[PDB]
């Protein structure tokens, strides 16, 4: 089934180039035909050269027939070069355009609502899905696919023209095919197995390495030299055998098939001479046939060598195509033209009997019903990480709940446009990763220039931008401190200036002074907008207008800090850390 | 030279591999000579000679076949041997560096040049033994033999090699000129994909995803032009090569007719001659391709060379030292990442805290007590012995230093705890845990101390990470312990417990405490203050409450 899936993958993109992809078939057919009768003409040419010689012995002919056949052969070779020119160029052009199309296709599909895929699959695996499989397809189409097609066409043509030329000699010369194909299948299969094992083992090794070469500081402090080197050496010994086998069986194929070509030309020589001396008396025709068949054997195993070599590329390519097809069948889940395009929240945000979890079984939250008002804010706290952080995931409708409703004024999240939603509501997430370019790009992530100054001042970070060289124009993509990443994220959100804001525990790794700077940044963020906040350090948002506390996704208490402390509860216990 | 320096170990297999290469080449170069001989015998009609030459030819063909397998297997043996040896040597060098020498390069740079380059050079040397040495001897042998068999055609060989050299020059220019840029662009595409993916949360948080897609599509579009250019280059050269070879063969057939008058046996040569001619064309083109690919090998070997050769910042000196007395003193120290004129002294059985401006070498001065850094000016003597005088054995077995960041390694937590002491029994293990107040927390795990830990340690949160780190620090019960703001992430419930536990194991112990939180420092007997490389003063919490101005603008918080 994998072959069919990969073929469908290719088809989906190659459809848009049908006429050219069909014309190249005629081009290659003509090219192979011309390249396949060339040995016939060179053989006839040497035959006529022998005839010219024997005439020179007594007659001294005008070599007119020889000259004519050389004319034919030279013209055919030139036109062969022309055919190669044309189909190579056209194939390259179509491959380039198709590769661009499918690369943009993978990207576009990625930026659909496949949020669940990223949520479940580890980052490394999904990045691999791209950088290994699609790049393998790219390499295959760049160099692999044309080789196999050209070579198989050459193979069929040369077989047909052998049988048109001679019967017994060709029926014998191809007799080496079963041995060669057995060699190829065995070696390539064992190479696949052993190289996969080698890749696994070297992955384990380089993972051990990566981790040690990252933590070496503690090693130096405590002198773990001997133990770490011993473990590295043991894994190195394992990969020693692994890579020995893998490398040998990977590199064996090409020389093995070359030697097979040697023995093939040898055996065809043997039968050619035997037929020539013991068979037809017309030695001139005999030797012409012999040299012709030598050329044929070379041009026959060249396809076999090329296809066998490209087998490794193409098989892995089609497996990667299977993976990309699995991706391409993932539901986009984009919302339709739902009509409603929110322009202003109206300041009546709330939740209604919300039940949700990563998957329907064992929901992490149940019956969540909270409301928020004009420029108001709500403080949240409960079980660490999941169980409380998840509610935000629904607030942006990253996921969609099975049942229960959330709205900003009556209208449920399912109603309005996703784009308008994301535009009108901002989110700040713990890690707060950055992007390529300059800090100006990261703040803009927008069609705004001077608003960055106001935002950075509001983000209490402007001093830090001006501190660096060329200020906002400082390229970045490392070399940047921790809290300032979150500060940049806050600045980004405020320049977005959405109606509603949601923030997590922004004080994950920061000092008290940076914490206070983050706090005044919060004040700036909340001062003008309604906002939710997830807080584990209660001191951060002690001045919350209203406070919510969660059991494992169930609201258990609510109210003001003073209300929630004069009212005995889990909130007071948590506060009692101070 | 480094590759051969290492391969001296496998020269024994290298020689046999090269001999295998040689035999393969000589067989492949004779078989067309024997082709000429046999079809010449057909011309001369010697049945017994025909049979003898045929059997010789098939035998030599099989000999070349087996030469192929032996060549590849032993070339692989040498290649893997050199790769393993060089990776091991580099790993040893890395582990023998000083922390500064490690800082000379980024961890990503270390890992990439340690894993990608090593395999790149392994594959390169594989191709080198299996292929490279084949091309030059193949080329010269084909040249000389073809000259021998058809001397009158000597010039056409020169013409063909000239033409192929011309087109190969065009390639060696344009293809590289475009290969560098397309490699950079393909790397750029993967980089932007990485950045977008990890940010998918924020990217989808904004409609800017559409513009990000437009940017990615633009970049791919520039990639398209270069890809089309290189495709055109293929479509020009490959037809160009095939055309030149075919034209040379046909010209060989055509011009030989001008000399057959006085010698017809040249009919016998012509076929083997064209075979040799195609052979030499293929040999030169593949040699050019492999020479071009050799540039990456050159870059990789250059990159690995410097890391291999670089010497450390710290060195052994003279004799192993006595047991550390337990005192620490500074003598007008200076350092550049930074520090200058630093001086202070603390005696056995005392506690002191350090505080300074954020980012103003948050922990570097403390990091200097470990010899991983060296005082550029001045000196420090710990226990009355200078850093230049002490040897690493005593430092580790008498001093410890919790890093500014928590670090864990794959496997079990028990081994990571054992990092501090090789033979720390379990009993000492839970003693350290209780000192860090982790016994119950660890008990909550699947097994406990032997429970597993992720490679990145993502199955535990930051607080218990700090706790594990401090346990590792205290397991050895060293005379000197350095505590660096380990309380700045966990819950504000166990800082009192950890400081209290330190306040009972303090016997015969002196510790340095670093943090921006004076709260954890108030329990310190003494305190030192620093500001951007300048020592502010020495004293105590209450005394500095009025003595120095820097105290107040942190104390108010």
């Amino acid at each position, epitope marked *: 089934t994998d072959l069919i899936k990969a073929s469908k993958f290719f088809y989906h993109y190659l459809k848009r180039y049908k006429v050219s992809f069909l014309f190249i078939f005629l081009a290659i057919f003509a090219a192979t035909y011309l390249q396949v009768k060339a040995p016939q003409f060179v053989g006839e040419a040497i035959q006529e050269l022998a005839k010219y010689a024997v005439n020179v012995m007594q007659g001294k002919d005008d070599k007119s027939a020889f000259v004519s056949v050389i004319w034919k052969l030279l013209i055919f070779y030139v036109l062969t070069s022309a055919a190669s020119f044309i189909y190579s160029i056209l194939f390259t052009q179509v491959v380039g355009k198709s590769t661009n199309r499918m690369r943009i296709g993978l990207f576009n599909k990625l930026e659909k609502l496949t949020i669940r895929f990223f949520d479940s699959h580890q980052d490394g695996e999904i990045l691999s899905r791209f950088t290994s499989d699609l790049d393998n397809i790219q390499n295959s189409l760049n160099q692999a696919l044309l080789q196999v097609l050209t070579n198989i066409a050459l193979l069929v043509g040369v077989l047909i023209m052998m049988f048109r030329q001679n019967v017994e000699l060709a029926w014998a010369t191809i007799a080496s095919t079963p041995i060669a194909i057995l060699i190829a299948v065995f070696v390539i299969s064992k190479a696949r197995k052993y190289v996969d094992l080698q890749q696994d083992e070297v992955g384990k090794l380089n993972g051990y390495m990566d981790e040690k070469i990252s933590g070496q500081r503690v090693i130096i402090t405590n002198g773990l030299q001997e133990e770490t080197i011993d473990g590295f050496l043991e894994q190195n010994e394992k990969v020693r055998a692994a890579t020995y086998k893998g490398q040998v069986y990977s590199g064996l194929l090409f020389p093995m098939m070359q030697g097979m070509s040697l023995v093939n030309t040898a055996i065809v020589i043997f039968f050619g001479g035997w037929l020539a001396i013991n068979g037809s008396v017309d030695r001139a025709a005999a030797l012409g046939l012999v040299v012709m068949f030598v050329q044929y054997s070379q041009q026959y195993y060249q396809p076999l060598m090329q296809i066998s070599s490209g087998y490794s590329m193409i098989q892995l390519a089609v497996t990667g195509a299977r993976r990309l097809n699995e991706m391409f069948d993932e539901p986009d889940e984009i919302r339709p033209e739902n009509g409603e395009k929110l322009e202003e929240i109206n300041k009546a945000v709330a939740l209604n009997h919300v039940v949700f979890g990563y998957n329907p079984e064992t929901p992490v939250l149940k019956d969540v019903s909270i409301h928020v008002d004009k420029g108001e804010m709500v403080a949240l706290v409960g079980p660490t990480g999941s169980g409380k952080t998840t509610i935000m995931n629904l607030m942006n409708r990253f996921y969609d709940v099975n049942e229960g409703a959330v709205t900003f004024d009556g209208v449920d999240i399912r109603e309005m446009d996703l784009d308008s939603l994301r535009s009108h509501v901002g989110i700040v997430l713990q890690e707060s990763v950055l992007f390529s370019g300059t800090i100006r790009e990261n703040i803009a992530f927008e069609a705004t220039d001077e608003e960055i100054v106001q935002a950075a001042k509001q983000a209490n970070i402007h001093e830090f931008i001006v501190n660096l060289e060329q200020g906002y124009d400082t390229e970045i993509t490392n070399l940047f401190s921790t809290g300032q990443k979150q500060l940049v994220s806050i600045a980004r959100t405020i320049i977005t200036n959405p109606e509603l804001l949601i923030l997590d525990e922004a004080t994950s790794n920061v000092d008290t002074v940076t914490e206070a700077k983050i706090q005044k940044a919060m004040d700036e963020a909340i001062k003008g907008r309604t906002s939710f906040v997830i807080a584990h350090r209660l001191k951060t948002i002690l001045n919350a207008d209203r406070i919510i506390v969660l059991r494992d996704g169930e609201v258990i208490e609510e109210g003001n800090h003073h209300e929630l402390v004069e009212q005995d509860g889990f909130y007071a216990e948590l506060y009692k850390n101070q | 030279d480094l590759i051969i320096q290492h391969a001296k170990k496998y020269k024994g297999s290298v020689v046999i591999a090269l001999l295998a290469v040689i035999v393969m080449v000589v067989s492949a170069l004779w078989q067309p000579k024997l082709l000429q001989q046999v079809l010449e015998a057909i011309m001369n009609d*010697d049945s017994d000679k025909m049979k003898n030459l045929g059997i010789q030819l098939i035998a030599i063909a099989g000999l070349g076949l087996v030469a192929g397998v032996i060549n590849t297997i032993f070339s692989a043996k040498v290649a893997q041997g050199v790769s393993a040896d060089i990776r091991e040597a580099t790993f040893r060098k890395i582990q023998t560096f000083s922390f500064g020498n490690i800082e000379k390069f980024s961890a990503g740079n270390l890992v990439v040049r340690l894993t990608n380059d090593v395999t790149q050079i392994q594959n390169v040397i594989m191709i080198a033994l299996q292929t490279l040495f084949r091309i030059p001897f193949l080329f010269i042998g084909s040249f000389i033999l073809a000259m021998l068999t058809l001397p009158q055609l000597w010039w056409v060989i020169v013409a063909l090699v000239i033409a192929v050299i011309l087109i190969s020059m065009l390639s060696f220019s344009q293809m590289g000129k475009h290969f560098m840029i397309i490699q950079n662009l393909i790397d750029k595409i993967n980089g932007i994909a990485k950045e977008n993916l990890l940010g998918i949360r924020v990217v989808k948080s904004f409609v800017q995803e559409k513009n990000q897609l437009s940017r990615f599509t633009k970049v791919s579009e520039e990639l398209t032009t270069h890809n089309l250019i290189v495709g055109s280059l293929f479509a020009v050269m490959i037809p160009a090569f095939m055309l030149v070879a075919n034209l040379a063969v046909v010209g060989s057939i055509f011009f030989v007719s001008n000399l057959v008058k006085d010698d017809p046996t040249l009919i016998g040569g012509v076929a083997s001659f064209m075979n040799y001619l195609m052979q030499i064309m293929m040999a030169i083109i593949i040699g050019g391709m492999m020479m071009m690919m050799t540039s990456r090998a050159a870059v990789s070997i250059k990159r690995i060379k410097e890391v291999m050769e670089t010497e450390p910042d710290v060195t052994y000196k003279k004799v192993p030292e006595q047991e550390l007395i337990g005192s620490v003193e500074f003598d007008h120290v200076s350092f550049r990442y930074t520090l200058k004129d630093i001086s202070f002294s603390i005696q056995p059985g005392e506690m002191i805290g350090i505080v300074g401006a954020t980012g103003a070498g948050k922990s570097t001065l403390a990091q200097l007590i470990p010899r991983l850094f060296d005082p550029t000016e001045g000196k420090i003597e710990v226990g009355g012995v200078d850093l230049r005088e002490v040897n690493e054995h005593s430092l580790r077995k008498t001093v410890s230093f919790v890093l500014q960041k928590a670090i864990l390694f794959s496997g079990t937590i028990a081994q990571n705890l054992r990092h501090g002491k090789r033979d720390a029994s379990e009993a000492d293990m839970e003693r350290a845990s209780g000192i860090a107040q982790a016994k119950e927390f660890i008990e909550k795990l699947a097994e406990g101390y032997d429970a597993p830990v992720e490679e990145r340690s993502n199955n535990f949160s930051g607080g218990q990470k700090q706790r594990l780190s401090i346990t590792r620090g205290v397991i050895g019960e060293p005379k000197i312990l350095i505590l660096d703001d380990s309380t700045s992430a966990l819950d504000a419930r166990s800082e009192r417990l950890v400081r209290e536990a330190l306040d009972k194991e303090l016997k015969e112990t002196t510790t340095i405490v670093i943090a921006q939180k004076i709260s954890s420092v108030v329990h310190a007997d003494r305190i030192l203050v620093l500001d951007n490389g300048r020592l502010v003063g020495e004293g105590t919490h209450e005394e500095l409450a009025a003595t120095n101005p820097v105290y107040q603008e942190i104390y108010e918080t």
Partner: nanobody
Amino acid sequence: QLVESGGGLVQAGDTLRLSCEASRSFNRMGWYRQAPGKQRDMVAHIFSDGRTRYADSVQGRFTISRDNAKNTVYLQMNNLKPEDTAVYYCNGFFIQDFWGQGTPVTVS
């Protein structure tokens, strides 16, 4: 082209050395014969190197020789019998069988 001399009247039991020369041509040579009314048929062959092969009818009696210095060939008739009477030719060729005019020998 070729040239052969030596043939003539002989008796059953006589000895005659045939001698043929090539027009600057270097070849594997051999002698053929034609009995009156019979087809051209092989008699013996001498390889360019120097080794040879004879027809059973003449095996053990007739001897062939050549001189590579000039590509001349010889064949020693000896112990003749009446059936040996025929016209003989010297042959040396590459593809098309070059043969000389040949000469007759009559075994009386």
